Design a protein around this ligand. Sequence first.
Ligand SMILES: OC[C@H]1O[C@@H](O[C@H]2[C@H](O)[C@@H](O)[C@H](O)O[C@@H]2CO)[C@H](O)[C@@H](O)[C@H]1O
Length: 140
Amino acid sequence: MSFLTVPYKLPVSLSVGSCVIIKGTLIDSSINEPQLQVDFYTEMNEDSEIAFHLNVRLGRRVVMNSREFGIWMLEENLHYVPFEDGKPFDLRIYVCLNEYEVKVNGEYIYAFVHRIPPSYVKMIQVWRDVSLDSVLVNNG
Ligand SMILES: OC[C@H]1O[C@@H](O[C@H]2[C@H](O)[C@@H](O)[C@H](O)O[C@@H]2CO)[C@H](O)[C@@H](O)[C@H]1O
């Protein structure tokens, strides 16, 4: 089946216990830009609040933040970058009471404490030059 077209947008409803699962492959083909970006918006509009932002800079860092009232807030940086140019990845973002649990390829890498209640998220966008296999939201 074909890769999803990027930028890829998905309307969503998140609650405690929801799990966002993103599968794809990153390419080392950008210059001064991340190779993957994930944004959780509070409206189906790119000017709305970003409750959760993640971007991947291969070989350098994974960056997480929020954009509240138009402003990028406290940046949280990881120098553990479990993504590899040309290799497939499994990115899982699990909504807990107090944080998102960020998981890559079966490794628990970061807990991002909620700044906006995740019940306010309405749209996920996945973009940059990722070859995107699937994006889904599950719960039980
Ligand atoms: O905080 C996420 C936010 O970062 C912006 O870029 C930052 C960059 O991460 C930092 O290393 C640099 O020192 O400052 C920049 C602020 O302009 C991105 O532009 C933005 O899209 C988010 O990714």
